[model samples]
Target: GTSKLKYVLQDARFFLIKSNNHENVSLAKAKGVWSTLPVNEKKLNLAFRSARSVILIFSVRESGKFQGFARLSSESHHGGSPIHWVLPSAKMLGGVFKIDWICRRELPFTKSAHLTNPWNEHKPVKIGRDGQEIELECGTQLCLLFPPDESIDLYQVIHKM
Candidate 1:
């Protein structure tokens, strides 16, 4: 059990954040907007603000199924932009984080073969719970979407050139 925690790194640049609200979910699917989490501003700022590109995974807290992924490019340290709407606060809500979605894509949560990996089998909480402050190694899980790249239209193969 302790050994698994090692995968949750201190300097991890990629984060999988939860977004259980309908408005935030839709807004994220749209051009994208900032979302709140049950985390301290200082903690989140320290963990992700400096990242060149922070990878975000949106999952339903109740169902524990992943819904979308985004490459976050920037944040709002002070306040959200004018068009952004603040959704319902997290149960233990700490503060909000701005989401600049550089490349946002929703996944097929139920039937995608892309999600058949061992990690995906576990509940989303296994990755990290609310306020748990866990993060993943950059691009590690991104490689799991497998062979015959052209076979699937919904999921894209992301590889370094």
Candidate 2:
């Protein structure tokens, strides 16, 4: 496995998650948040006098385990902003990493603990990425996803909105 900082380096200028945009959209399905496509409709305002603003994913951890994730869809805008409320978090990123015995970050992403399979020292933990899902071999099972891309949208096409 890898660490929370462990990620596939796509480009040098920006070593992305293996991923999106600022005014970014993210969702970790650790437990649940009002994480629905409709959530984006909720206009959020930010105080970024710095010409530009970026939305980012944020994940949290406790006792070496993950708690939740959040998205910062906050981008730069002129006048007032949309006054609405989405989930305390965003989409519902899930996988085998959903377990507490790991390392992690915002948007509830994770970097599997780099170690021989304690569950089976002979069976090295394996990780890989498909179109929109991550796969890992733990013990006897391999887990994938249902394509995080939004079922009906543009941004979601290139991203996991």
Candidate 3:
């Protein structure tokens, strides 16, 4: 069923560190292994930007679909109680579809932007959509979706910030 899908749905453990020292950095942010979103229905975010919190978000694709979480910090920091949020998939989408991404969090208003999965962009591409089903031909519209009914495990490590 999913054998026709372009990618595998899985978990990611991003390594980021906090440091007051900016010797080898322009901005005080962590850098290590990075990820390119493989699907449209999935994404990443910070739990509390500009706060002393270590809260990460996690969501496994539903029995038939998928999505994203807020942050990826350890539970051993501070008060340190860990929690998880599971957003089950309502439907498993199919094919190379595109979504017209509206940059709602773009620029001057927010330093960061949440893009569509795969985050692929095309300035001028053609596409169509029927309800939630996508019909992508060629365009920057957006796209990807999947489900393996599998539970993903993300192991986190705080870097030398």
Candidate 4:
């Protein structure tokens, strides 16, 4: 039996989170905490609650490139109720994830980008075909990467964290 493959398949979960600017990315990495968007508020909160280890990709908006990645803890803290849901302000409504591990990398965009043509200027990163798997109600989308596809690369990055 291929025990090696089995171990690979059971590794950490990967979620993509797009940051509007470099400032947010820097703050997230420095502070070891990140806020969620109201887009998929419910779905995201659930995912973070169950996922023992989650690898989050911080994609820059204008640049359309992956700036950094962070590993999230299973525990999550909610900002507030639906009435207080804030579009831009994460601390007021959406779920906030405390990063247990993280890394910053200069990587290209995934095919998910609408404006920029992906795979140009650098190799494009692969995300699962399932669209918007882990979106939050605050309009924040966190995509889950399928198993075994990015698992290898994901582990290498986790080791660095």
Q: Quote the positional error of residue 92 for candidate 2 in Å.
A: 29
> What overall lDDT goes with each candidate model?
0.43, 0.22, 0.20, 0.47
Which ten contiguous residues of candidate 3 have the minimum total lDDT?
A: 97-106
lDDT of 4 by residue, 1-161 (tens): 23432332244455556655677677766667767655545555666556544556666666755665556653456543223222345344456667643335555545334322132222233332211432231112222221223223444433433
lDDT digits (tens) for residues 3-115 of candidate 2:
11112111101101212221222233332222223222222222112212212122221222222222222332223322222323422322111101111222222343442
lDDT of 3 by residue, 66-127 (tens): 12212333221222222221212312321211111111111110211222222124211111
lDDT comparison, 1 vs 4, better candidate? 4
Which pairs clash in the backbone of model 1? Answer: none
Q: Give the TM-score of candidate 3.
A: 0.16
- Candidate 3 segments whose C-alpha is farther than 4 A from its true place: 1-57, 73-75, 78-161
Model 4 regions more than 4 Å off? 1-9, 78-92, 110-131, 134-161
**Candidate 3 collision pairs:** 56-71, 57-71, 98-142, 99-141, 99-142, 122-140, 125-139
TM-score ranking, best first: 4, 1, 2, 3
Best by TM-score: 4
